[PDB]
Symmetry: D2
Subunit: 264 residues, 4 copies
């Protein structure tokens, strides 16, 4: 079946890439970066995030795999030393698929726009253009809070180990179909009030951020960060779409969390 | 159908109880506190927790309802002024059922014991007998961390608004079948290391606490707190059992959270 | 003695300003905004911060007073209804002086620059140009940590109720001659490590931030926020300079904290 | 001059103790554990805390030194390998003295008692007898907050690296004459309100905890933890008394913090 390999582009990753391609030549197995059915990422988690966003229109037709050339990421998942074993396993068709939830982000504007929709594997965040940051937070059409602070982060389950974590969020097992909202430096006094706690939302729950003042926002979706102007609504929900992984071997989520934060 | 009413036992709750009983006399509707199919709690959330634990062997045959005589709890849910409307609605059989996940706790001992199993609607916690507190945390048979601190809290989704919240935990929608673990005053230096973050676990995941030193622990299950001696394992998992509520009207979880923490 | 009055510039503040000026005409008391000995701020804390920064070269020759036209700020301190009583008290010379510590910030560059020095009443912060943020933190010439995250905040004691607070910092009584450093969304895993906790530093302690990558930083000093380029060092220390307040009456710091965050 | 040595009482500490005593025999230098002028602690920080509490009536006449037989504590401060060098230095009278602030705790009761006063080098804490914990917090005679939660911790500056830290407190340089108050699992909703933040208090500020319900409290002072009954007031203040250290060499506080929490 058709595959492609992205590389971080340093000496180590390119050489491993060329080796795997040569390895794949002894099977069938066809290189195709337009319509791959396997996408192998070699580098780190940032490399892996770029690979996902490259093929974010073909998610239902692709199974991703990551190899880490340094740490040990949460998306890659294979050591360089295991590259040969992986070539043989991929070529044999010797894998089950595992799916992780994604986050759908919708930015609505005033005319012209032309709403934009984004898909995130880690998180989307919102901050001001700089700028006091003030939004009304609306959960399933009901006004929940007026947030004043530095911004908000909405994380997928596999994104919980990233930005979500730095902000005091929970780590959620990625079999849970949910998104998690954390505060960045909320202001709380006797007049301005936020929940404080991170909030975890199931599928079909919609979290809507609405401008109070100030309709310009710096919005991030994984690595991408853009200033959006004349924003009417930022709308968060668990995507109907999933990312599929090829595995292969047991490497439990909590073991990855252990290895990354406790040690090994 | 058979019902019973528990009261907080102050003047206000007893009178509302007697009124509802009189109200129920005009229907059928039979009072029975041994095998009720409806359990109405009048008081607060503590009243409601006592009602659940009274009937924790009959959960699959009961639908609970709470009335709050002060605040506004997360389990009750009806204002005293709505008592008459509720009598008519209960009597008519005019309700759908909503189910919340429960937490199963297993305490294993050395001979004699005779493991004990407990069911929690809010949380179970563990602290020392007093006492440095040190446990090994084992997730699905794999050693995750050695926790040193004041204790650990394992919360259900509806318990997230309680003890879980005070500890920095996430608020989780109770449609999510999960349990959440938070730290109490963890010790972290270059030698002792915990994850820090709260952890959210799906069904079938098992979290096991094992003594390092020190086999005596003060274990809480909702209101109940007991010193357990010669403990070999404390085992946490999402229960297969659920609590059923009678509703009635829309009162969304996030609206309850809003009313309780933001205002109204 | 010579005074001046700054106003927030809304209807309420301008009218109170003109009234106080008329009131001051019945005494002596001379209006002078070039070399005032009394600076009265009417508005909020932002108004007060602007007044301080206007006269930050004459601090040793000035006594500040704030009037709040809405809340209740930490710098103002007088209700509009008390304006007449304040005119008489100021004119009589009926006040003792109270001094608060200030924060000195030094930004060093590569040639050309021409180091810049700034004085802060609340805090100075550092974030990236956008941009992973990574700095080496050096305390009294010794390398303390490599910080990776969103930024750092260094707060004076009276600034602790502001940005410092949102970040998890301690509230410090302003009689303590100290500065406090908090983290913004620090990254911590088995490889990247920060202290986590806020750090409180006495006089003469120097905290130095040094670029790792990336020599461009968005630096704030109270309201002012500038992108500095080709930065070699950001240097934090308790200033030798103090701000002087005129009081008047007892309004204890902890009472102000109570009124602002608990209620009243 | 007269000295004494306490040991942790394991094989390693006793042998080092006997060696130092033999070493001290070649000077003058007299062993006296009733009225020592030098107290050397060999073990860890717990060993050191016991040594301080042994001689807490003679603080003004003593200079303490700690040797750590494992880690690296904040009070000891010398490696076993440096024991000989330390004997010679102590015997020569080749040291300046450094003083750290202490915390005075006063427990007032109803008749009989007979107030008790305690001195803490790390912290004093308060929790319930078990037991919802509810106290009124009164700062300099003014009611600041009604705290509901698990307890409160009041830490000295050198205690900030201990229990204070686990609770989210600031690390304070021990040249600052201050005490710091942190919350343990505070309850906060629209009805019950605490400050959240840690509070840092200068000398002469008095923090008073008063029972709301419930006059029984589990009070800790460093290692000591006692249930006090029929309590009317717990009163916290920076002590007029200081602990004196013998040094010797530069080992800056922030370097100790680095070594203990970052690495080395
Ligand atoms: N304060 C914060 O915690 C903070 C601030 C901004 C952004 N971020 C995170 O960085 C990600 C991408 O940022 P960027 O492209 O601008 O580069 P970046 O900030 O330099 O990347 C940050 C680090 O996040 C790691 N990472 C990626 N996914 C992760 C996951 N699911 N769990 C744990 N760590 C993960 C990456 O690992 P590799 O080295 O293997 O690539 C990288 O080292 C975002 O999606 C966000 O989660 C965090
Ligand atoms: N530091 C803390 O946050 C802390 C410490 C110990 C226990 N607790 C909580 O208290 C519960 C029972 O404790 P207790 O029997 O010993 O009496 P308690 O400590 O005096 O009760 C604590 C409060 O928790 C409220 N509560 C109960 N369930 C809740 C929920 N799901 N969400 C938000 N608040 C809730 C109760 O409301 P009502 O007034 O309506 O009854 C009560 O006022 C435990 O299950 C635990 O969650 C909290
Ligand atoms: N996430 C955060 O907590 C956050 C983010 C950015 C900036 N800030 C704070 O805002 C200050 C100025 O910001 P800005 O000029 O850009 O306008 P701003 O962000 O809109 O002002 C923020 C608020 O801080 C209040 N404030 C000022 N000094 C304070 C103090 N010492 N204690 C408690 N609150 C205080 C002001 O009160 P008034 O309404 O009376 O003016 C204002 O409402 C900064 O010095 C910083 O402390 C906080
Ligand atoms: N959750 C918590 O963070 C927690 C809970 C209870 C008590 N404590 C702390 O433990 C101290 C004594 O407790 P204990 O007698 O019952 O024995 P313990 O709890 O077993 O001792 C706790 C640890 O604290 C260390 N320590 C002592 N002073 C310190 C300091 N100033 N900075 C950093 N670490 C320090 C000790 O080091 P050594 O091994 O060298 O002796 C010991 O390992 C208390 O004074 C309190 O600060 C902390």
């Amino acid at each position: 079946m058709k595959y492609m390999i992205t590389s971080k582009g340093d000496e180590k990753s390119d050489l491993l890439r060329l080796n795997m391609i040569a390895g794949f030549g002894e099977y069938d197995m066809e290189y195709d970066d337009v319509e791959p059915e396997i996408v192998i990422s070699i580098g780190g988690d940032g490399t892996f995030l770029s690979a996902f966003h490259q093929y974010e229109e073909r998610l239902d037709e692709i199974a991703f795999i990551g190899i880490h050339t340094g740490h040990l990421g949460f998306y890659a998942d294979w050591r360089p030393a295991e590259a040969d074993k992986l070539v043989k396993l991929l070529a044999k068709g010797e894998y089950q698929k595992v799916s992780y939830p994604l986050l759908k982000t919708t930015v609505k504007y005033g005319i012209g726009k032309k709403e934009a929709t984004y898909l995130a594997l880690n998180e989307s965040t919102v901050k001001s253009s700089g700028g006091p940051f003030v939004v009304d937070v609306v959960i399933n059409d009901i006004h929940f809070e007026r947030f004043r602070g530095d911004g908000l982060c909405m994380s997928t389950p596999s994104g919980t180990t990233a930005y979500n974590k730095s902000l005091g969020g929970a780590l959620m097992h990625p079999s849970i179909e949910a998104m998690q909202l954390t505060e960045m430096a909320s202001i709380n006094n006797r007049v301005y009030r936020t929940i404080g706690s991170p909030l975890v939302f199931p599928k079909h729950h919609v979290v809507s951020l609405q401008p109070v003042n100030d309709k310009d926002f710096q919005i991030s979706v994984d690595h991408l960060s853009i200033l959006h102007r004349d924003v009417q609504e930022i709308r968060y929900e668990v995507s109907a779409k999933k990312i599929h992984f090829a595995r292969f071997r047991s490497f439990p989520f909590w073991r990855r969390v252990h290895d990354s934060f406790i040690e090994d």
